[PDB]
Amino acid sequence: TVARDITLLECVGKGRYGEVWRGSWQGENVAVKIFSSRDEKSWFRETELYNTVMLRHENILGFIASDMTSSTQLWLITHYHEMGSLYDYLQLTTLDTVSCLRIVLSIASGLAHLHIEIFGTQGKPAIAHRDLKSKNILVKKNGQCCIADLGLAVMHSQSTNQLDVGNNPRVGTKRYMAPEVLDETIQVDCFDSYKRVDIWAFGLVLWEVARRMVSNGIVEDYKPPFYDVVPNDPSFEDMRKVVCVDQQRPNIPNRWFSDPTLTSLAKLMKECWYQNPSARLTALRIKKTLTKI
Numbered sequence: 232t233v234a235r236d237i238t239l240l241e242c243v244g245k246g247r248y249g250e251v252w253r254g255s256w257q258g259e260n261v262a263v264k265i266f267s268s269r270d271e272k273s274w275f276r277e278t279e280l281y282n283t284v285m286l287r288h289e290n291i292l293g294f295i296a297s298d299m300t301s302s303t304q305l306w307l308i309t310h311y312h313e314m315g316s317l318y319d320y321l322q323l324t325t326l327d328t329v330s331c332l333r334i335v336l337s338i339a340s341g342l343a344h345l346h347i348e349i350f351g352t353q354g355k356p357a358i359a360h361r362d363l364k365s366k367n368i369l370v371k372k373n374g375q376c377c378i379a380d381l382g383l384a385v386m387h388s389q390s391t392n393q394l395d396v397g398n399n400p401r402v403g404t405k406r407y408m409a410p411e412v413l414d415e416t417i418q419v420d421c422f423d424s425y426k427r428v429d430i431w432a433f434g435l436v437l438w439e440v441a442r443r444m445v446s447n448g449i450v451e452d453y454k455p456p457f458y459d460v461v462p463n464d465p466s467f468e469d470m471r472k473v474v475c476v477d478q479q480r481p482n483i484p485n486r487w488f489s490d491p492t493l494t495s496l497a498k499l500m501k502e503c504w505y506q507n508p509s510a511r512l513t514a515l516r517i518k519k520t521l522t523k524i
């Protein structure tokens with residue numbers, strides 16, 4: 232019924248996943264993500280998650296409804312953030328210390344919230360995202376972010392030791408894939424493995440953002456991770472060669488060591504990028520560290 236009352240106004244995004252539209256519902260802007268045929272299973276997983284797990288959180292994209300509307304389409308209706316994604320926003324502006332730390336702390340807060348199981352009737356299972364990237368993190372006008380696109384999410388309950396992986400043909404974006412995914416050594420039956428996959432990807436987003444924080448009048452152009460060492464649309468084997476075989480990691484600009492904030496974020500992101508997954512920081516530790524900077 233939400234879908235029948237929505238007026239679609241403007242397409243604001245298009246990809247292999249489908250399309251995103253700005254719509255109006257009860258006079259308020261809403262985001263309508265219209266899934267492609269190729270990605271119907273992500274719609275299904277996200278719908279199941281939003282209808283069975285209490286997820287609401289400042290830094291998780293707000294859910295309104297899911298619907299199959301009648302031509303038949305699969306729609307996921309959420310709050311609308313006119314700044315669009317971090318990918319979009321980082322390309323039209325540079326950041327200062329305050330706005331950079333607000334972005335990265337808000338992502339760490341949302342990720343910690345996903346990862347941590349909460350006991351009881353007001354609680355939730357532990358959740359790992361598995362495809363975190365700058366294109367599915369939204370920026371609010373108040374400068375905080377929120378994480379979207381839970382179609383690959385996996386859940387875990389420590390009490391019963393049940394791991395719910397989805398059976399989704401989709402895999403994570405290859406440019407952001409962790410070493411253990413690329414060399415197929417990931418322990419697929421351990422929930423902690425998916426959390427560590429998230430932490431790797433977070434480190435890459437951290438790098439993407441920090442580059443855009445000005446210090447002493449200097450800033451880097453926006454670039455996606457590994458822009459300098461793999462082609463656009465890199466293959467799985469392109470990524471395995473660079474990340475696993477050659478052990479490359481995004482370069483830290485020297486100008487960052489003149490700013491205390493960027494020096495601290497540089498230390499943080501390198502501790503997300505250990506080849507050994509169990510050596511990476513946890514989301515909560517990142518959150519704590521960023522609350523102190």
Ligand SMILES: CCOC1(c2ccc(-c3cc4c(N5CCN(C(=O)C6CC6)CC5)ccnn4c3)nc2)CCN(C(C)C)CC1
Nearest residue numbers: 243251262264310311312313314315316319366367379380
């Ligand atoms: C008319 C263009 O306008 C700009 C723009 C771009 C996007 C949005 C926008 C996207 C979303 C959203 N999505 C659904 C959840 N996601 C995913 O699943 C990603 C695919 C994996 C993220 C996208 C949800 C909620 N809100 N939302 C707003 N809004 C505005 C594009 C560029 N311009 C420039 C020209 C100035 C500015 C804004």
